Amino acid sequence: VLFQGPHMLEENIQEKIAFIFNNLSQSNMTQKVEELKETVKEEFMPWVSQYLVMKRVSIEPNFHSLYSNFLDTLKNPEFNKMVLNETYRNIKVLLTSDKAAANFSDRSLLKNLGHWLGMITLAKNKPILHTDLDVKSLLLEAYVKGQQELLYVVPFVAKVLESSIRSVVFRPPNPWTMAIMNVLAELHQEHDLKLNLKFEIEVLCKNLALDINELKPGNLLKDKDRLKNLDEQLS
């Protein structure tokens, strides 16, 4: 379904996969799950993964609970990792892309993918490995590159951390979750940071049932030695 070629029109595999996820509901879910297994070869699941993440998930955050339930009913761990790896691939296209304040779509895509990321990782009690994505280092990197990168990253990080509440492990006061919240707390009390991002962080705090003044900012934004030698995840 990515780069759909000439031979895939007659049978229209994308048009067939699309029939599964559109008009999907809690009512017809078990019917759609069995239909996916019945009408689509197991060899084609990578393409199904690509269609789900890219064509649906990235522009339908209202449907993420439904799609996450789809994965649950499907019970295909191999397909779940396809989706996860495909989720990381899409996140990186946006992270490594060239940023502007003028393009809103790319930021909404990045957020929705972040929200989805947390719903299939944190909320399912599975960690976001730093080999795939280093969240805390992402914030530190966004700080040195300027407001343009911060505008992309901060709401993105907020959307993935929102799922820690529905997690049994990643809820506060998880050392991993709180380590990130402390860096955001550090960014919050920076005269440089725009007001909307300061507001974004406060919204996130209450969304995690936290008092932003009970957080414990460190001195990571002043560690210029650590700031320069970051493994870059942005452009």
Side-chain angles (χ1 to χ4, degrees), residues 18 99 120:
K99 324 294 182 318
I120 60 169

Side-chain angles (χ1 to χ4, degrees), residues 53-61 64 87 90-95 97 103-117 152 156 159:
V53 166
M54 178 174 180
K55 297 297 208 304
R56 319 304 302 146
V57 154
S58 68
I59 48 115
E60 298 174 343
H64 288 178
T87 300
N90 279 267
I91 289 177
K92 295 187 172 106
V93 172
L94 290 160
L95 288 188
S97 68
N103 41 25
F104 293 59
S105 326
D106 287 16
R107 299 206 238 100
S108 293
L109 291 170
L110 181 56
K111 280 204 297 284
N112 298 343
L113 286 161
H115 181 247
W116 169 254
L117 175 64
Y152 271 68
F156 162 77
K159 287 293 161 295

Side-chain angles (χ1 to χ4, degrees), residues 22-30 32-41 43-153:
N22 295 11
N23 288 343
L24 175 74
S25 57
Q26 295 289 349
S27 303
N28 59 8
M29 168 146 298
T30 49
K32 293 291 188 178
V33 170
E34 277 286 342
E35 209 184 307
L36 176 67
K37 293 185 286 189
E38 178 184 2
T39 68
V40 171
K41 308 294 181 181
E43 283 88 337
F44 299 160
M45 290 303 172
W47 299 340
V48 182
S49 168
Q50 297 172 3
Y51 175 75
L52 180 57
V53 166
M54 178 174 180
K55 297 297 208 304
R56 319 304 302 146
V57 154
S58 68
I59 48 115
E60 298 174 343
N62 198 34
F63 279 97
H64 288 178
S65 325
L66 194 60
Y67 293 143
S68 182
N69 275 278
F70 189 90
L71 300 182
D72 286 345
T73 312
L74 185 58
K75 290 163 188 173
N76 194 341
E78 295 298 325
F79 176 78
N80 287 337
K81 184 153 164 285
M82 293 188 197
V83 172
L84 180 55
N85 292 333
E86 194 67 24
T87 300
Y88 282 130
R89 264 183 286 268
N90 279 267
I91 289 177
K92 295 187 172 106
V93 172
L94 290 160
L95 288 188
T96 60
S97 68
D98 280 23
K99 324 294 182 318
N103 41 25
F104 293 59
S105 326
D106 287 16
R107 299 206 238 100
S108 293
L109 291 170
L110 181 56
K111 280 204 297 284
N112 298 343
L113 286 161
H115 181 247
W116 169 254
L117 175 64
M119 271 193 54
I120 60 169
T121 52
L122 302 184
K124 316 242 192 181
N125 302 315
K126 305 178 181 302
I128 302 185
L129 304 179
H130 81 83
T131 85
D132 296 326
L133 185 65
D134 198 318
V135 182
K136 198 179 78 176
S137 172
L138 186 65
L139 292 171
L140 295 182
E141 178 177 355
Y143 173 66
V144 323
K145 299 202 175 186
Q147 297 297 327
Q148 201 79 290
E149 284 69 18
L150 288 169
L151 184 60
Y152 271 68
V153 175

Side-chain angles (χ1 to χ4, degrees), residues 119-193 195-222:
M119 271 193 54
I120 60 169
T121 52
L122 302 184
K124 316 242 192 181
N125 302 315
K126 305 178 181 302
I128 302 185
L129 304 179
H130 81 83
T131 85
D132 296 326
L133 185 65
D134 198 318
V135 182
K136 198 179 78 176
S137 172
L138 186 65
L139 292 171
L140 295 182
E141 178 177 355
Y143 173 66
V144 323
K145 299 202 175 186
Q147 297 297 327
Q148 201 79 290
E149 284 69 18
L150 288 169
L151 184 60
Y152 271 68
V153 175
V154 176
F156 162 77
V157 172
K159 287 293 161 295
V160 59
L161 281 188
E162 280 183 9
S163 302
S164 60
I165 293 310
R166 299 135 215 165
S167 178
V168 120
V169 208
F170 296 104
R171 49 171 56 221
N174 195 290
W176 181 85
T177 299
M178 295 294 94
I180 304 178
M181 294 302 304
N182 292 337
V183 169
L184 286 177
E186 194 168 347
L187 282 173
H188 178 258
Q189 53 186 15
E190 209 80 358
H191 294 168
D192 204 26
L193 189 72
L195 301 323
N196 65 339
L197 296 190
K198 292 196 179 188
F199 188 77
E200 177 87 24
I201 298 174
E202 297 192 30
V203 168
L204 176 61
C205 285
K206 295 173 181 300
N207 268 328
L208 293 182
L210 297 178
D211 178 26
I212 191 173
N213 290 317
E214 278 202 12
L215 295 179
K216 305 168 171 184
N219 303 318
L220 284 183
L221 295 189
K222 315 241 178 305

